[PDB]
Amino acid sequence: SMPKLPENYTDETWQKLKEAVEAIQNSTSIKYNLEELYQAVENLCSYKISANLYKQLRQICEDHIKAQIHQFREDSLDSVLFLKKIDRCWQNHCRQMIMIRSIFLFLDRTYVLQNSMLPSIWDMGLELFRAHIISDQKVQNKTIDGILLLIERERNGEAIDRSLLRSLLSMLSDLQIYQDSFEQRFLEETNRLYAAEGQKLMQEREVPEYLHHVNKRLEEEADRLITYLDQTTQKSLIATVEKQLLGEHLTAILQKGLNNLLDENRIQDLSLLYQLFSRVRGGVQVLLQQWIEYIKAFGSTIVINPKTMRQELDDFKDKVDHIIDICFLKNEKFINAMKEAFETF
Amino acid sequence: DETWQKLKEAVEAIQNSTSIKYNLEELYQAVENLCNLYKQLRQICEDHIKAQIHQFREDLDSVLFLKKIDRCWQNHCRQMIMIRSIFLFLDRTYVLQNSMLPSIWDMGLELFRAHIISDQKVQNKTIDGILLLIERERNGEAIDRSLLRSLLSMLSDLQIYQDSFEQRFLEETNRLYAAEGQKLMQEREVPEYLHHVNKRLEEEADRLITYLDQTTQKSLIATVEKQLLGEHLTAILQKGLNNLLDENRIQDLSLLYQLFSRVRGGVQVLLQQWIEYIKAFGSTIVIELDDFKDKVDHIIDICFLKNEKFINAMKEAFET
Amino acid sequence: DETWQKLKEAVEAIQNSTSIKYNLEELYQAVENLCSYNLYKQLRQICEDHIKAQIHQFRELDSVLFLKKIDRCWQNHCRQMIMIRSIFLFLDRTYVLQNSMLPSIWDMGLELFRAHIISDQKVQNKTIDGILLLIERERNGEAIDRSLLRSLLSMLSDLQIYQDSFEQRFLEETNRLYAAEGQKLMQEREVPEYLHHVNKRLEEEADRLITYLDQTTQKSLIATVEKQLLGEHLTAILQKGLNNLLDENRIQDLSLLYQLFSRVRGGVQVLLQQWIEYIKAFGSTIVINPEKDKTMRQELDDFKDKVDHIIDICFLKNEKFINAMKEAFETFI
Amino acid sequence: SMPKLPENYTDETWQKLKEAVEAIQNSTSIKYNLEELYQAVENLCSYKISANLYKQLRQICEDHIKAQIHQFREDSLDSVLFLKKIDRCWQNHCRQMIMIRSIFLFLDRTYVLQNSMLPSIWDMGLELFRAHIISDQKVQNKTIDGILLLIERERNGEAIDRSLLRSLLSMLSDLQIYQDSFEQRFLEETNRLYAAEGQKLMQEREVPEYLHHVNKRLEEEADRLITYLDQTTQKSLIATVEKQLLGEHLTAILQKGLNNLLDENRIQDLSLLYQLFSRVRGGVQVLLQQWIEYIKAFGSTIVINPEKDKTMRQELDDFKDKVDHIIDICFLKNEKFINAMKEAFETF
């Protein structure tokens, strides 16, 4: 049993706001001065029910957003051009919703809706954009497929628009669907790519070149993470790269290349090896075991194929002490390993 | 094996609350030497937690049951904090190596959730008991708020407060206050009803501060507001507003305005009845105007906080 | 030049709440052109110019009318900044897409409002004094605009000066008011009425906290109320009222007493000790000066039943009180 | 008047806990079964005041921590060995406090201290460690100097213990002094190093090699950030590297190398150039302006000074094709460069 709103005729006040919002939506002129609109909002929450004005605004927002779906059926459109079109649609939505939020600030801030479980105006916009644009199965699949394809291209050496990618993945975070839509597939595809890369390059390249490559990839993925992914992806991503390029090959690497690195006294590469293996569960342990093996095999070759035995031992001890000192950072475990291994001969 | 056994015995001692028959240094060393160890620790943790389920089939008085859950929760926490101290090296190297395995502490929570609180019988009995204590409190009984704080806090730590407890809690609150609103609106005059509604809002604020989670705040207060005021706005004004205004009851009018201000449509419905009152009373004088204007100005000023909307309504009404 | 002017005029329209006499597309384009060929500094400056100008109205004044004027100024500021943010969204986002240390447009606005309006010593003091006065009035029974208060305190939080400006003074004033209230009402009122009052105040302050204060104030506020109304009077309360509550079997009040004392350091402990004392004294008076109309056995059973019931309902079956009671009984049974 | 605590004699109950804590502190045996200690804590909060038991525990914690300062006067000790000593001390502290926290869990969780402003047992331990060990001017300066030196060494190509560095910087975060003690100096030092590196390498190396180097450094610093620094350092750090290696040299890079990159058709390098300049305020704008200049200049030569080999229509088509291709691959089809080029073409 409500009161009559002060206005010249029924619905005058709401109409002004309807027209203002449509102007915002079509990017034309707002043909009222702003004070009048702020007042309109204040009157409509004072004499009528706030929850109703919110429903009215939600509806005209929904009508417009629903209408923006159609531009995304124009396939088979170029993948990048599609992603740009989604981004432009996202920017226009955000711009419009921020402006609407300014006009209706009183509604957002109202004491009566303190306790309401109705989303804020901004969040209401996000629900609508999620529900009607990005949740559509065809649009989502094409958007996510395009994002993943850009990352794949970059990992293969191509130049892409990282800025476009940042903007899209950031949209996915604002819509709270980054984890669901994008992240699991991204980690799946990263797992598949680096599993295959690990196995392929471990045949094609010698250990020193492989380790240099693994280091580059870890630095690259850090840079991807900093530049356009969400921080919540960091542990998973690095763990995946570490696992596929190092974890799966720890023993193979050592078997193929450790003897050569140690025989040939390759200090820089030995340092790198130790840094990389330090990143993975079991790494230093597996290294330490093969180190014991190398050291034991050398003593057997001294006693069997000796010009002087003491001198040959001293030379080896010096070389190996030095490697422990610089490449393995003075790690006591390697010193002990070595002393135990020496007692074998 | 010798080394692992020491840690196995240590952990069992922690689990049975008996003596740790090694000096701590020796244990720290044992952990450092052994760095599978995580899986071994997980397993002996799981074995013990699984074994704690059986005490909850002995059903038993609701409060005694909740205390038994709380004790089990405290012992679990205590034990896991202590295990975590001994195995700190394992936690930190797992953290220094990027592992996707949960920390020791979190591993404990998954096990407690999975084996104790997730069980349908235990969960239903725990949540039923919590809800019963709140209901009893709302009825004027004294309960152990401390027990309640501790159990709800457990539900937050296990990350199941929203799922298990909160929806049922809001359901039960909705039911209780729906029925209270209808009952007391018949039994009590408006002044006494409004005083009561104010008490309930203050009480529920207190429950919230003292033992519930902040994420329950909006929902809870909105429910109390909706059921005690929102559903009765028009009936309250019809039953009591003419008397409050005729009799110049300023304190009650202030309270009315404060309460109605909290609820959708409240001030609006009040505003409309205000216009009605002024038109009717003003019509009876014209069929003295200064005395009425003074009375009315004073109510606007004190009870309605100088609200411009009521000043305008009144000026328009006087032009009748 | 030409292009910047359009944006300067638009922003001035927003600031004076008049009409924006360009269509929005043209403005969005103007912002995009100006970044595609200092603009942030220019926008900061025209924002600052306007906000600076809003100080003058606060040199005039009734406390509530002053606070309303501050609130209006805050709402307009927010409204204007949100709208400016819409037009210049491209600038915000390509600052965010470029790693910049410059605050967002929105945050830039908050720095300016803090610096020019609320940070002024006279305006801040008058604002804080008014806020404190409204809370004091409310605590004294007066009806105030909670909505105004919520809005102003929430402004203080957005400007990140709630802890500095308001909260310490608020806790000081609360401490003072409840210290004096505790001492005054402990003289004026019997224990049952005092406890009922303390409970009301705790419920009230919970409500103030929920309704308009920041959650960070919760622990401090409730501890202060607890300390001044209960902590400072635990012994005096028991001395003045515990014998009457127990003699007269006042179960509701005993329940409340236990609930309240449970909230405070030393509370249950001091209660427990006086409980032991009561039982020893009362028990001794049964065995020494028995009532003629009961048998000795009946009198002792009656007392045991009364006491068991109090433990059970008022003290929540607390084992410590059961033990204290059994021990105490052996002093006479 | 407080009640009498159930115990055989005054202070029996507290003594058990005092001995328990000392055992924890010296890493020896806890000579009571744990149940008895848990009970002791509960009794002391039930019959006596919680706040007092907390003060007592704080004091015996403080006494021990204060005593751990002296090992850090053994200078002039090797920087790494010092840092390892600080880390060991930090681990022991943490270990001891977690275990003390287990015994006194009831005290931490008590309802009466809900409203207390007293820090949790754990946080109490952090205040004490901060106040007595890491806050000491000599210890802090040596700790921070050593951390900064390890980073500097890493940037210069040496292998360091990143794990040690992660653990120490993480301690600094737990003690809430990462921003104060470390971060401002770290950004100062990073600013100084890369300002110098930018100026030095921009003389020593041609543009292609410089850009490749800058790219490496940005990838490296990302890796440092991920591996041992706090995330709150990310924006500042990258901005600094970007500013000193690219921002300060945008014009110089283009003036030294852009004509060559374009004349010689160096597509890979042009792609990298665009990616790097895209990271910096003004980057693409400055690149766009020089692009216009190149196209006007080269086009003006393609009409005033013809080649004998082709008609000049062919020479223009060859140039258009080259330039379209660069826009397409190096500049990612950027409309701004298409327009710039069309405008520039209308000049000749």
Structural domain boundaries in chain C: 1-116, 117-233, 234-333
Rounded-to-integer distance, Cα D96 and Cα C143, Å: 54
Domain C234-333 sits in CATH at 1.20.1310.10
Rounded-to-integer distance, Cα A200 and Cα A197, Å: 5
Helix A184-204 with A250-263: angle, nearest 10 deg: 40
Nearest CA in chain B to A275: B97
Interchain CB contact of B92 with A (< 8 Å): no
Are residues C219 and D117, on separate chains, in Cβ contact within 8 Å?
Answer: yes
- Written as one string, the DSSP assignment of D196-245 is HHHHHHHHHS-HHHHHHHHHHHHHHHHHHHHHTS-GGGHHHHHHHHHHHH
Instruction: Please say whether the structural domain B1-115 has been given the CATH code 1.20.1310.10.
Output: yes
The token duo for C297 is 């056995």
| Contact by Cβ (8 Å): C70, C58 | yes
Nearest CA in chain D to A274: D159
Interchain CB contact of C251 with B (< 8 Å): no
Superfamily classification of domain B233-320: Cullin Repeats (1.20.1310.10)
Domain D250-348 sits in CATH at 1.20.1310.10
Q: Which residues contact residue A313 at a Cβ distance below 8 angstroms, ignoring those fewer than 6 apart?
A: A302
Element (H, E) at A275: helix A267-277
Interchain CB contact of D234 with A (< 8 Å): yes
Query: What phi-psi label fits residue A229: left (phi over 0), alpha (psi between -120 and 50 degrees) or beta?
Result: beta
Fold of B116-232: 5 helical Cullin repeat like (1.20.1310)
Element (H, E) at C90: helix C89-96
Interchain CB contact of B208 with D (< 8 Å): no
Interchain CB contact of B142 with C (< 8 Å): yes
Interface subset of D 174-203, CB within 8 angstroms of C: none
Superfamily classification of domain C1-116: Cullin Repeats (1.20.1310.10)
Residue B315 CA: distances (Å) to CA of A45, B193, B296, B311, C235? 21, 31, 11, 6, 58
Interchain CB contact of C269 with D (< 8 Å): yes
Q: Which of C41, C50, C56, C58 is nearest to C11 (CA)?
A: C50
Tell me which DSSP letter residue A232 carries. G
Of C20, C78, C89, the CB nearest to A91: C89
The token duo for B248 is 């110049």
Superfamily classification of domain D1-132: Cullin Repeats (1.20.1310.10)
Rounded-to-integer distance, Cα A244 and Cα A222, Å: 16
Interchain CB contact of A280 with B (< 8 Å): yes
Rounded-to-integer distance, Cα A295 and Cα A75, Å: 64
Residue C308 CA: distances (Å) to CA of B145, C192, D122? 21, 22, 41
Rounded-to-integer distance, Cα B228 and Cα D43, Å: 45
Rounded-to-integer distance, Cα A50 and Cα A9, Å: 20
Half-sphere CA count of C144, side-chain side, radius 13 A: 26
Residue D305 CA: distances (Å) to CA of D299, D311, D345? 10, 12, 16
Q: Which residues of C touch A29 (CB under 8 A)?
A: 20-24
Rounded-to-integer distance, Cα D286 and Cα D253, Å: 11
Whether A1-132 and A250-345 share one fold: the answer is: yes
Of C23, C25, C79, the CB nearest to A102: C79
Backbone angles phi, psi at A189, to 5 degrees: -70, -40
Chains with 3+ CB–CB pairs under 8 A to B are A, C, D
| Contact by Cβ (8 Å): A232, A294 | no
Q: Which of A177, A72, A53, A200 is nearest to A126 (CA)?
A: A177
Rounded-to-integer distance, Cα C118 and Cα C127, Å: 8
Q: Residue length, chain C?
A: 333
Rounded-to-integer distance, Cα C46 and Cα C236, Å: 63
Q: Which residues of A touch B219 (CB under 8 A)?
A: 115, 117
D154: distance to nearest CA of chain A, Å? 12
The token duo for D77 is 């000790």
Q: Which residues contact residue D317 at a Cβ distance below 8 angstroms, ignoring those fewer than 6 apart?
A: none
Interchain CB contact of C294 with D (< 8 Å): no
Q: Which residues contact residue A82 at a Cβ distance below 8 angstroms, ignoring those fewer than 6 apart?
A: A72, A75, A142, A143, A146
Of B206, B214, B303, the CB nearest to C215: B214
Domain C117-233 sits in CATH at 1.20.1310.10
| Preceding amide of A120 cis, omega within 30 | no
Interchain CB contact of B101 with A (< 8 Å): no
Query: Measured at the alpha carbon of residue C216, what is the angle toward residues C168 and B105, in degrees to the nearest 5?
Result: 135
The token duo for C45 is 């400056």
A330: distance to nearest CA of chain B, Å? 18
On the 0-12 / 13-18 / 19+ scale of CB atoms within 10 A, D96 is buried
The class that CATH gives domain A250-345 is mainly alpha
Are residues B268 and A236, on separate chains, in Cβ contact within 8 Å?
Answer: no
| Contact by Cβ (8 Å): A93, A129 | yes
The token duo for D299 is 């086009």
Element (H, E) at C87: helix C63-87
Nearest CA in chain D to A159: D271
Backbone angles phi, psi at D68, to 5 degrees: -75, 0
Experimental structure resolution, Å: 2.6
Chain position carrying tokens 């690195």: A261
Interchain CB contact of C99 with A (< 8 Å): no
Torsion angle, CA of A339/A343/A345/B3, rounded to 10 degrees? -100
Q: Which of C140, C210, C218 to mutate to test the interface with B (most CBs of B within 10 A)?
A: C210
Of C17, C90, C151, the CB nearest to A34: C17
Are residues D226 and A238, on separate chains, in Cβ contact within 8 Å?
Answer: yes
Tell me which DSSP letter residue D32 carries. S
D279: distance to nearest CA of chain A, Å? 9
Interchain CB contact of A115 with C (< 8 Å): no
The token duo for D308 is 């004998």
Rounded-to-integer distance, Cα B81 and Cα D105, Å: 9
Contacts of D136-139 with C-beta under 8 Å, sequence gap 24+, read D136/D69, D136/D72, D138/D72, D138/D73, D138/D75, D139/D69, D139/D72, D139/D86
Residue C43 CA: distances (Å) to CA of B210, C92, C110, D63? 47, 11, 14, 57
Q: Which residues contact residue C193 at a Cβ distance below 8 angstroms, ignoring those fewer than 6 apart?
A: none
Instruction: Please say whether the structural domain A133-249 has been given the CATH code 3.30.300.30.
Output: no
The token duo for C248 is 């007269």
The sign of the dihedral angle between the CA atoms of D309, D315, D321, D326 is: positive
